[PDB]
Design an enzyme around this catalytic site. Structure first.
Site, PDB file in Angstrom:
ATOM      1  N   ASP A   1      47.192   7.085  31.925  1.00  0.00           N
ATOM      2  CA  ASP A   1      46.371   6.488  30.963  1.00  0.00           C
ATOM      3  C   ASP A   1      45.087   6.947  31.108  1.00  0.00           C
ATOM      4  O   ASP A   1      44.515   7.035  32.130  1.00  0.00           O
ATOM      5  CB  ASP A   1      46.601   4.935  31.047  1.00  0.00           C
ATOM      6  CG  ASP A   1      46.244   4.137  29.893  1.00  0.00           C
ATOM      7  OD1 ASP A   1      46.512   4.333  29.008  1.00  0.00           O
ATOM      8  OD2 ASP A   1      45.675   3.066  30.439  1.00  0.00           O
TER       9      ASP A   1
ATOM     10  N   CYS B   1      52.625   5.877  23.164  1.00  0.00           N
ATOM     11  CA  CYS B   1      52.117   5.747  24.472  1.00  0.00           C
ATOM     12  C   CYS B   1      51.815   4.164  24.685  1.00  0.00           C
ATOM     13  O   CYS B   1      52.678   3.498  24.490  1.00  0.00           O
ATOM     14  CB  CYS B   1      50.867   6.763  24.985  1.00  0.00           C
ATOM     15  SG  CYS B   1      49.669   6.727  23.752  1.00  0.00           S
TER      16      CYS B   1
ATOM     17  N   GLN C   1      41.588  10.152  23.334  1.00  0.00           N
ATOM     18  CA  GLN C   1      40.907   9.065  23.692  1.00  0.00           C
ATOM     19  C   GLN C   1      39.704   9.449  24.758  1.00  0.00           C
ATOM     20  O   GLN C   1      38.920   8.903  25.122  1.00  0.00           O
ATOM     21  CB  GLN C   1      41.504   7.984  24.285  1.00  0.00           C
ATOM     22  CG  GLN C   1      42.228   7.200  23.190  1.00  0.00           C
ATOM     23  CD  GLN C   1      40.611   6.223  22.653  1.00  0.00           C
ATOM     24  OE1 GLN C   1      40.505   5.587  23.573  1.00  0.00           O
ATOM     25  NE2 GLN C   1      40.535   6.042  21.252  1.00  0.00           N
TER      26      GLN C   1
ATOM     27  N   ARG D   1      47.169   9.510  24.668  1.00  0.00           N
ATOM     28  CA  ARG D   1      48.218  10.387  24.783  1.00  0.00           C
ATOM     29  C   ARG D   1      49.084  10.973  23.669  1.00  0.00           C
ATOM     30  O   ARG D   1      49.523  12.161  23.324  1.00  0.00           O
ATOM     31  CB  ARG D   1      49.176   9.926  25.929  1.00  0.00           C
ATOM     32  CG  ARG D   1      48.309   9.793  27.360  1.00  0.00           C
ATOM     33  CD  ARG D   1      49.200   9.110  28.321  1.00  0.00           C
ATOM     34  NE  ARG D   1      49.133   7.494  28.034  1.00  0.00           N
ATOM     35  CZ  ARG D   1      49.357   6.692  28.812  1.00  0.00           C
ATOM     36  NH1 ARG D   1      50.139   7.002  29.897  1.00  0.00           N
ATOM     37  NH2 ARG D   1      49.149   5.371  28.510  1.00  0.00           N
ATOM     38  N   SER D   2      49.195  10.141  22.547  1.00  0.00           N
ATOM     39  CA  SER D   2      50.249  10.080  21.649  1.00  0.00           C
ATOM     40  C   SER D   2      49.424  11.238  20.590  1.00  0.00           C
ATOM     41  O   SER D   2      50.150  12.224  20.003  1.00  0.00           O
ATOM     42  CB  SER D   2      50.310   8.881  20.896  1.00  0.00           C
ATOM     43  OG  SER D   2      51.347   8.274  21.519  1.00  0.00           O
TER      44      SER D   2
HETATM   45  C1  LIG Z   1      40.063   3.393  18.557  1.00  0.00           C
HETATM   46  C2  LIG Z   1      38.863   2.824  19.311  1.00  0.00           C
HETATM   47  C3  LIG Z   1      37.736   2.527  18.557  1.00  0.00           C
HETATM   48  O1  LIG Z   1      38.445   4.011  20.254  1.00  0.00           O
HETATM   49  C4  LIG Z   1      39.269   1.720  20.300  1.00  0.00           C
HETATM   50  C5  LIG Z   1      40.187   2.176  21.505  1.00  0.00           C
HETATM   51  O2  LIG Z   1      40.583   1.019  22.100  1.00  0.00           O
HETATM   52  C6  LIG Z   1      41.525   1.039  23.149  1.00  0.00           C
HETATM   53  C7  LIG Z   1      42.091  -0.242  23.814  1.00  0.00           C
HETATM   54  C8  LIG Z   1      42.884  -0.175  24.845  1.00  0.00           C
HETATM   55  C9  LIG Z   1      43.535   0.803  25.026  1.00  0.00           C
HETATM   56  C10 LIG Z   1      44.729   1.134  26.050  1.00  0.00           C
HETATM   57  C11 LIG Z   1      45.223   2.240  26.369  1.00  0.00           C
HETATM   58  O3  LIG Z   1      46.042   2.155  27.253  1.00  0.00           O
HETATM   59  C12 LIG Z   1      44.826   3.635  25.444  1.00  0.00           C
HETATM   60  N1  LIG Z   1      45.525   4.796  25.983  1.00  0.00           N
HETATM   61  C13 LIG Z   1      44.671   5.722  26.831  1.00  0.00           C
HETATM   62  C14 LIG Z   1      45.833   7.014  26.623  1.00  0.00           C
HETATM   63  O4  LIG Z   1      45.468   8.221  27.352  1.00  0.00           O
HETATM   64  N2  LIG Z   1      46.820   6.579  25.762  1.00  0.00           N
HETATM   65  S1  LIG Z   1      46.811   5.207  25.234  1.00  0.00           S
HETATM   66  O5  LIG Z   1      47.993   4.519  25.719  1.00  0.00           O
HETATM   67  O6  LIG Z   1      46.685   5.231  23.842  1.00  0.00           O
HETATM   68  C15 LIG Z   1      43.796   3.454  24.568  1.00  0.00           C
HETATM   69  F1  LIG Z   1      43.536   4.531  24.156  1.00  0.00           F
HETATM   70  C16 LIG Z   1      43.112   2.160  24.534  1.00  0.00           C
HETATM   71  C17 LIG Z   1      42.242   2.200  23.361  1.00  0.00           C
HETATM   72 CL   LIG Z   2      48.305   5.694  34.431  1.00  0.00          CL
END
Ligand SMILES: CC(C)(O)CCOc1ccc2cc(O)c(N3CC(=O)NS3(=O)=O)c(F)c2c1
Ligand SMILES: [Cl-]
Ligand SMILES: [Cl-]
Ligand code: NA
Length: 299
Positions: free
Chosen positions: A181, A215, A262, A221-222
């Site tokens: 993550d 993900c 991200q 990741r997606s």
């Molecule tokens: C769109 C925005 C304005 O940036 C707000 C983003 O707010 C979040 C909130 C919770 C998250 C939890 C995750 O586990 C996650 N991941 C990290 C990864 O590497 N893959 S993921 O599973 O997508 C997120 F990116 C998240 C982003």
């Molecule tokens: Cl992890």
């Protein structure tokens, strides 16, 4: 390649955070009115990750058509993906309803059910052949048929049955288990080995519905997975690595779902994966065997 020159310049100037912040600043902002309706609160895993209204997948049901899922339609590359959150205990039926209705052949899972001591995704598929899952709310049954377990990923063959019609479909499930993550894959080779395993299955092919990629939130990741795949497909069209502008492709994808990729290091990794994958696209088919070896998928 111009992509390699750009990578070298960003690395030398140490400006990945600034480049990445530029992308966040320029990224599309579209309404997510349906995702934010009170009745849909328990269908969203994360308050701040929602599908845009214009690209959300609608379930084909009259009661409530909402699922936290987005259709990413890459017009120039001629490939579509559905990106979705890790299903919740109450949305696993919705998830498989979406897979059925959208005619997807593959599901790509880039997270684990538990990460960093917290639950990130429901156990939405069966792990034992003799313990099938029935989703009463969406009239679907799901059976594990076989699996191929590798060191850092598992491929499962599932059978999805519409209990109303008794029609059945093969679904291939690709589970990447070592991508943390907010982190990156262990190497370009391990990522590309997995991506081309998905490609070789037929799950990304236009004869099928869009692959479902998820993900935990369906964006970090997606997004990395789909950006690399689309860039390599664009490069394939005219065998021209310098014709792919990775930042432009990422901004295009972000028209369809917020927050794709991200971290700045996920962006940097995307460049690495596309630059390495270019060796295969540009005609060195033998590099695929090298990735398989370097990935240590047996060990
Ligand atoms: C769109 C925005 C304005 O940036 C707000 C983003 O707010 C979040 C909130 C919770 C998250 C939890 C995750 O586990 C996650 N991941 C990290 C990864 O590497 N893959 S993921 O599973 O997508 C997120 F990116 C998240 C982003
Ligand atoms: Cl992890
Ligand atoms: Cl962990
Ligand atoms: Na290079």
């Amino acid at each position: 390649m111009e992509m390699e020159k750009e990578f070298e310049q960003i690395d030398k100037s140490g400006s990945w955070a600034a480049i990445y912040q530029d992308i966040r600043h320029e990224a599309s902002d579209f309404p997510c009115r349906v995702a934010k309706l009170p009745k849909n609160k328990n269908r969203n895993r994360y308050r701040d990750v929602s599908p845009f209204d214009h690209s959300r997948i609608k379930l084909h049901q009259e009661d409530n058509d909402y699922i936290n899922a987005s259709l990413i339609k890459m017009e120039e590359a001629q490939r579509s993906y559905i990106l979705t959150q890790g299903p919740l205990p109450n949305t696993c039926g919705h998830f498989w309803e979406m897979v059925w209705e959208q005619k997807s052949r593959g599901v790509v899972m880039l997270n684990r059910v538990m990460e960093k001591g917290s639950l990130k995704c429901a156990q939405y598929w069966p792990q034992k052949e003799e313990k099938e899952m029935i989703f009463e709310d969406t009239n679907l049954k799901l059976t594990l048929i076989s699996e191929d377990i590798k060191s850092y990923y598992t491929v499962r063959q599932l059978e999805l049955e519409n209990l109303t019609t008794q029609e059945t479909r093969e679904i291939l499930h690709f589970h990447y288990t070592t991508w943390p993550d907010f982190g990156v894959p262990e190497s370009p080779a391990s990522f590309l080995n997995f991506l081309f395993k998905v490609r070789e299955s037929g799950s990304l092919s236009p004869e099928h519905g869009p692959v479902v990629v998820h993900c935990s939130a369906g964006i970090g990741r997606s997004g990395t997975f789909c950006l690399a795949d689309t860039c390599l497909l664009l490069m394939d069209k005219r065998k021209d690595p310098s014709s792919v502008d990775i930042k432009k492709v990422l901004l295009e994808m972000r028209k369809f779902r917020m927050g794709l990729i991200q971290t700045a290091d996920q962006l940097r990794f995307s460049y690495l994966a596309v630059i390495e994958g270019a060796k295969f696209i540009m005609g060195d088919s033998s590099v695929q065997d090298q990735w398989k070896e370097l990935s240590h998928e047996d060990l």
